[PDB]
Amino acid sequence: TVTEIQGGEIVSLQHLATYLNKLTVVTKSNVLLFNVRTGKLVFTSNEFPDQITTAEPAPVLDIIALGTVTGEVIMFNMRKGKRIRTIKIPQSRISSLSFRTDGSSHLSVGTSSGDLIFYDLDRRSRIHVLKNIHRESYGGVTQATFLNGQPIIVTSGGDNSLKEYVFDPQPPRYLRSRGGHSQPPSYIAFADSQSHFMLSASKDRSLWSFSLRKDAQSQEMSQRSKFPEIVALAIENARIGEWENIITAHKDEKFARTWDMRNKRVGRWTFDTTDDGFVKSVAMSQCGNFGFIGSSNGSITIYNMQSGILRKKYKLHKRAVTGISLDGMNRKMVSCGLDGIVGFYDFNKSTLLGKLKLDAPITAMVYHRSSDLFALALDDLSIVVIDAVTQRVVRQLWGHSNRITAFDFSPEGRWIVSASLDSTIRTWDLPTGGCIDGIIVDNVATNVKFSPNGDLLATTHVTGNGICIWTNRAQSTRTIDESEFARMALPSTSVR
RNA sequence: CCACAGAUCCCACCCGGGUUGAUGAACGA
């Protein structure tokens, strides 16, 4: 036990080389040496004026490096009990220390602001500083370690990333890294029909592709200070490699961006609304030839994904267009808006084929291409299912007690699964319109998507950086439910 | 596959040239 007279609050436990049976206990105020075999406190250093936050054994005898709340790294001799050296890092709070051990006498100093500083111990000069490699709001650099005998330093923070930096035989060069979002995913989509990749956007302003396979590989989409946060997303696998196959809408921007799934990078085109409105909805044809953009001012624009050229423009809605889609045969185009209007248009000409007026503002659309049904989420907490061929409402789903966050069709077309602020995930059988299953979660689902094949369900939630995968073990009764809902927990991070 | 480098190239500024010559131009105290 370290009583408060013996030392302060324990910060770190270290074992120095050749210190047989002797544990070094560094506290906020001093450094102790205990013989763990005999129990004897064999050493206690003088009081340290400034709070010690970090400690790290040096690659030479008797020396331990100590970081302080003030940007000081102190080389301390445990045998003689005195300072040997004190390096000052101006106005930084040290969070990690590591010595290079490949021949070069270098020291790395991580900080809470997310900087990684490299210092030459022999030339007594600052070698370099990797600025903002990890987010400060997530603790900055929480750990940075030179690999033993190698010119490689591994770094990490609370921003869900693990980076590796090298020193070529010169400033350090980015080598490789792995990561995900630092904030919960806001929008997701399955990228392909082989269940390989998922496209995922977050409020951390990033666009990522995550593999669904065992290697758990992932890669951020290159934006070559980030683009504003994504507010709508669409992707089609048809033209991968040939031209742009991803469209994103960004917060408070009057144009949509395009991306290339093959090269995992932003694409060539930007698609303007043309009516000075923000982009509120985006969509793509199944063939991959066309991009659709819905404006906050009501306009709908159709662009050519190959050349980037504006093809067609429609003006029906007088409020924000919240959803757009086109049938698999590119015959009939459908739209929805906050004005509660459902628009039906002929794609080959530009004729208004029809209009529906619903009783509440419409916030989102999901179109089922294999059944030509599309569902709409309304502000009155209902889900309206419409047949695109007949241009008629065929079903209306009532049950949710709060705002609907997301929904999707089961691949066959038999089911619709929906999520809400009411912290439920419900399954609706379309032939009856009744809720046949309900799940209560403790972490509200913000997205729900069926895999192209009926096997998996992907969900995103209010808290958590990742995407939850569920197995659809019903590939069932038509009995209605009420408070017989299941209170299920999210999948384990220990699986697979 | 991207990333990043590389050097080149310009490219335009920038400087000097330069209004007290840029150019190329085949010898014979």
Nearest nucleotide (CA of A222 to C1'):
B2
CA of A328 to C1' of B19 (A): 74
The method of structure determination was cryo-EM
Task: Please report, as a single letter, which amino acid is at residue A252.
Answer: D
Taking the C1' atom of every nucleotide in all shown strands and the CA of A265, the nearest one is: B2
CA of A91, C1' of B12: distance in angstroms:
42
Distance A49 CA to B19 C1' (A): 73
CA→C1' distance for A259 and B28 (Å): 75
What is chain A's alpha carbon radius of gyration, rounded to the nearest angstrom? 29
Q: Which nucleotide is nearest to A174 (CA to C1')?
A: B4
Say how far apart CA A334 and CA A355 lie, in whole Å: 10
HEC string of chain A equals: CCCCCCCCCEEEEECCCCCCCEEEEEECCCEEEEECCCCCEEEECCCCCCCEEEEEECCCCCEEEEEECCCEEEEEECCCCEEEEEEECCCCCEEEEEECCCCCCEEEEEECCCCEEEEECCCCEEEEEECCCCCHHHCCCCEEEECCCCCEEEEECCCCEEEEEECCCCCCEEEEEEECCCCCEEEEEECCCCCCEEEEEECCCCEEEEECCCCCCEEECECCCCCCCEEEEEECCCCCCCCCCEEEEECCCCEEEEEECCCCEEEEEEEECCCCCCEEEEEECCCCCEEEEEECCCEEEEEECCCCCEEEEEECCCCCEEEEEECCCCCEEEEEECCCEEEEEECCCCCEEEEEECCCCEEEEEEECCCCEEEEEECCCCEEEEECCCCEEEEEECCCCCCEEEEEECCCCCEEEEEECCCEEEEEECCCCEEEEEEECCCCEEEEEECCCCCEEEEEECCCCCCEEEECCCCCCCCCCCCCCECCCCCCCCCC
